[PDB]
Design a protein around this ligand. Sequence first.
Ligand SMILES: [Mg+2]
Ligand SMILES: [Mg+2]
Ligand SMILES: [Mg+2]
Ligand SMILES: [Mg+2]
Ligand SMILES: [Mg+2]
Ligand SMILES: [Mg+2]
Ligand SMILES: [Mg+2]
Ligand SMILES: [Mg+2]
Ligand SMILES: [Mg+2]
Ligand SMILES: [Mg+2]
Ligand SMILES: [Mg+2]
Ligand SMILES: [Mg+2]
Ligand SMILES: [Mg+2]
Ligand SMILES: [Mg+2]
Lengths: 116, 208, 49, 137, 85
Amino acid sequence: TPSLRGRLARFGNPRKPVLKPNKPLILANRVGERRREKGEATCITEMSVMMACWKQNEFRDDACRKEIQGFLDCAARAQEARKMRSIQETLGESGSLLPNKLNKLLQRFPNKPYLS
Amino acid sequence: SRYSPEFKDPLIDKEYYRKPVEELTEEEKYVRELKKTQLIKAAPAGKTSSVFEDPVISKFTNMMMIGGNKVLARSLMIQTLEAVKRKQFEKYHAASAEEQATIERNPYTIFHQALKNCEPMIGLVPILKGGRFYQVPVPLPDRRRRFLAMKWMITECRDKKHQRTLMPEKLSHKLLEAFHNQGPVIKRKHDLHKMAEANRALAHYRWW
Amino acid sequence: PRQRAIQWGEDGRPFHYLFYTGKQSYYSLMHDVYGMLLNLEKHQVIGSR
Amino acid sequence: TKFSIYPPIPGEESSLRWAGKKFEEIPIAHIKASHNNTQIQVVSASNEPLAFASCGTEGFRNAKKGTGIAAQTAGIAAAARAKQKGVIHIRVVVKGLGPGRLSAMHGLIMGGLEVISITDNTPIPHNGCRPRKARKL
Amino acid sequence: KHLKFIARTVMVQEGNVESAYRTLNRILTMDGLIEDIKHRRYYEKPCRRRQRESYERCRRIYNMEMARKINFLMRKNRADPWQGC
RNA sequence: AGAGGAGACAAGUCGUAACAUGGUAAGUGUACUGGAAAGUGCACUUGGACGAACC
RNA sequence: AAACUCCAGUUGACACAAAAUAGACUACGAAAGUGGCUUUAACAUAUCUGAACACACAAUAGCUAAGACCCAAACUGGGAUUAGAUACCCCACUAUGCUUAGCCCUAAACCUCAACAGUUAAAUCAACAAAACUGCUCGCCAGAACACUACGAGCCACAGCUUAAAACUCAAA
Ligand SMILES: [Mg+2]
Ligand SMILES: [Mg+2]
Ligand SMILES: [Mg+2]
Ligand SMILES: [Mg+2]
Ligand SMILES: [Mg+2]
Ligand SMILES: [Mg+2]
Ligand SMILES: [Mg+2]
Ligand SMILES: [Mg+2]
Ligand SMILES: [Mg+2]
Ligand SMILES: [Mg+2]
Ligand SMILES: [Mg+2]
Ligand SMILES: [Mg+2]
Ligand SMILES: [Mg+2]
Ligand SMILES: [Mg+2]
């Protein structure tokens, strides 16, 4: 962990400040939400193969059946994988813990930046 | 809906209930035992257990229906199937023995194959970006694909370009043309495919 | 409606040792169930809801 | 032996070969992936140009050039030309972090060229020239 | 002026170009080259650079401390031992 | 005494510069430019933010 | 779109420009500032405060004179956008940024937190901010706006900088 001694601008700190945070460097009792990953267009390569075969075969499906089937299978796999990814996000196995359970854990042991 | 969420859609399939118990898996056995305790919706009047039932043709008839006139839509559908069969019989008789084997005469097979041929593979979605609208190519689900085929067939048959030609005759002609991979509907599918191929560079604009 | 009796005598001393919890009945029930669980630890459906 | 991600060193005896050719002799596929374009040039180990293909040379224009699809098409074209010239395995050297940085590589693989190594040659000055001013968006 | 095919080079294993490119990108990311290129696309004025560095250092401190606390408390995520009391 | 400036009076006119990421973050010095608020270059400031474990 | 196609890609030769990573270090300097390498010289004061009446410095910008000029870039020109666009977006180029010799002496020059010595005891403490204080000294402040203004004076500065008012007005700021 990087040192904080003599970094912030404080009384008794002779040097000019190193860090100028816009928020206090105090741990919050919550973590950020499970940020979604912006979806990218999928099955582009199979679509390209199918379209190139269409261009070579004058958009005749009979000749291109194999590539068309490959593109369709890739599209179905992508849709089913999106559904499975939603299921996995609900499960939370990939991460060490879901943000909700982590927020509960931090609620159980809150930060104490004050005296009592 | 007047049905509470407990209600389940009925399953109309004689073979599903005549299946021997031994063949049933533990999952199927559990499902069958569970279904004895659920509530079941009344069987819709559209579909029955008749061996001559075709969900595809029933859906096409419903899509052809105007103002809840299912009698007329069903009449148009059966007239179309009869016209397809009669034209195929005429071609079969008028053709040589070699061509008789290749000629198809089942109207149901012709209808299904025509719809399958008319099915588009890649669709276009209008996406807003930078203040403009782009026709981004996208994959299509099988449901939307079949619906697009049916709707294109019906819309082409309803076009004003055909003058004083009854719906059964127009629909039969279009079905035969599509079965042979020709006609305005197949041209519409080809135009959609060509536009998608042209806009392929915009495929990355899609976020799903 | 069923009414709970007065919870303390003339002297003011409440009858139940869990009176000051404010939920003496519920907490007494929880206490008894936890004690039963401890006893069971020490020793070691369709028609109902 | 164990596979090593480090490339073999010229002047050292290495048992690794590709069609009987040493790592120093495998042709080089330079992929400049700019933010608006992707150019792929195949050259021999002796620095003899063999093929060239960019998103512009594939009929893509304006913003369409700076896409993964255009880079993949350029990679396919370049790989086809290189295979016509007799190239099978290539050392890939990519410079730039454009959209076509990876897809172009895929095109080469779709074209029929086997990538034996991948190298990044993105020009990173040690605080040399001063780049243009920041955009306001 | 240096030798070539030594720096930023990753050998492909059995044609697994995807994994080779992933490893190369991971190397560049860990060494910080990718962020350096992205920041060097347009000139970052010295005041802006100092502000970004201060923000990133504070973010690193906070993230490391939060990770330390999470790891410290993760053992307490176990089942409730005094359930019902 | 022709004029300039400030304040008040407060209109109408031309824009919308500032206050929210004010829709190009704001501001200081300085230079140039513009009907006008203002724009841009260079350095500086937070009297902005960067969402604050990993993803 | 304009622009360039004596253009782009590889390889080799290639600088009076700027100094990735180290740097998650917090150091040097009075401040301004200083983060490539080597060498030379070198970082005042064996009490403290103290000059706006002086002396010496002072980022960037700017002026003067001679050079360098990769790249960037006010202005300008073109393209685009827009109701207009004297801007934001794109392209090209100049003053300028660099070197040397003089000037100019200004910054949100702010860590808006003076130097030195000391305390954490309490009666801690308007609010926020970066806890509350004590002794000593210097500098500064005394409603807002007029006003980083006018006049006077000083300056290598001549559309400048420093010091800096008053009148009219308001019950606020
Ligand atoms: Mg505005
Ligand atoms: Mg603004
Ligand atoms: Mg500004
Ligand atoms: Mg201008
Ligand atoms: Mg002194
Ligand atoms: Mg100066
Ligand atoms: Mg110049
Ligand atoms: Mg230039
Ligand atoms: Mg410009
Ligand atoms: Mg220099
Ligand atoms: Mg400063
Ligand atoms: Mg001033
Ligand atoms: Mg003055
Ligand atoms: Mg004067």
